[PDB]
Amino acid sequence: MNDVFTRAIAQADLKGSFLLESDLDKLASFAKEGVKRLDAVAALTNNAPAIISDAAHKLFAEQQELIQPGGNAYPHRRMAACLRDMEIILRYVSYALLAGDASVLDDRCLNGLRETYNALGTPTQSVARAVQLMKDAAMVHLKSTANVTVGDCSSLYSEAATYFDKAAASIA
Template sequence: ERLQNYFHSGELRAKAAMTISANAATIVTRTTAKSLLYTDITAPGGNMYTCRRYAACVRDMDYFLRYATYAMLAGDSSILDERVLNGLRETYNSLGVPVGATVRAVQAMKEVTTEMLGAEAGKEMGLYFDHICTGLG
C-alpha cells in the first residue's frame, strides 16, 4: 500500500519540487521575514546580529528547504535524519544557536511553502518540515 501511494502521488511531488526549486530564494526570503526579522534575535546582541550570523541562518533555511524537498521527492524522511538532523541540535547548542527560533522558522517555511504550493502539495511537504521540527525539538 505504501508503494502504491508513493507512485500515486509521484506527479504531485514532482510538480511541487519543481515549484520549490524555481522559487527557493523567495521561499527563504519570505520565511526569514515572517519568522526571524524584527525580533530580538536580529537586534544587537541577538543570535542573528551581524551579517555573518544572519547569512549563516539564511543558508541553513535554504539547506532545510532543499533537504525537505529531497525527502518529499523520495517519500522518505530518513534522508533528513542522515543528512540534516544527526547531531544538528548538539551543534546548534554548542554554537549558541537558539533551537526554538530555528523550529519557528521551519514552521514558518512550512506555511510559506503551503501558500505557494496549495493545500495538497503543502500537506505532503509539511510532513518533512514537521520531521525537521520534531528532530530539533
C-alpha cells in the same frame, strides 16, 4: 539516504521473501502519484528564494533580538548563515518530498544539528519556528493551481507539513 521503494525492498530482504502484491500495489499507487509529486518538488525548488525571503521577513518581524547587538543574527555573517541554513533545510525537505522518505533529511543531518545548536547557544526554538514558517510559506506556494493542471494533492500537502514538523521537532 533511502526512498520508499527501497524501504519496501529492504524490508522484503529482511523477511527474506519476494515483494508482496499488497506492497506492490502501494508502490504502483506511489508511482502514478509521482506525477503530482514531481510538480510539488518543482514548485518547492522554483519558489525557494521567494519562500526563504518571505520566511526571513516574517521571522525578523516576529523575533527581534536577532537584530539587536548580542543577538545571534546581529553580526552580519551570522545572519548570512541564517539564510544559508534555511536554504539548506528547504533543499533537504525537497529531497525528502521527492523521495517520499523522511530519513534522507533526519539521518543525514539532524543527528549533528542537535548537538551543534546546543553547543552554539543559539535559540533552537527559533530555528524550529523558522522551519515552521518555511513550511507555511511553502504551503502557500504549493497550493498554486495556476500554471498546473488541477488535481488532488491534499496528501502531498500533508506530507510536506509532516516533513517540516519532524524536521522542526528534531531541531526542537
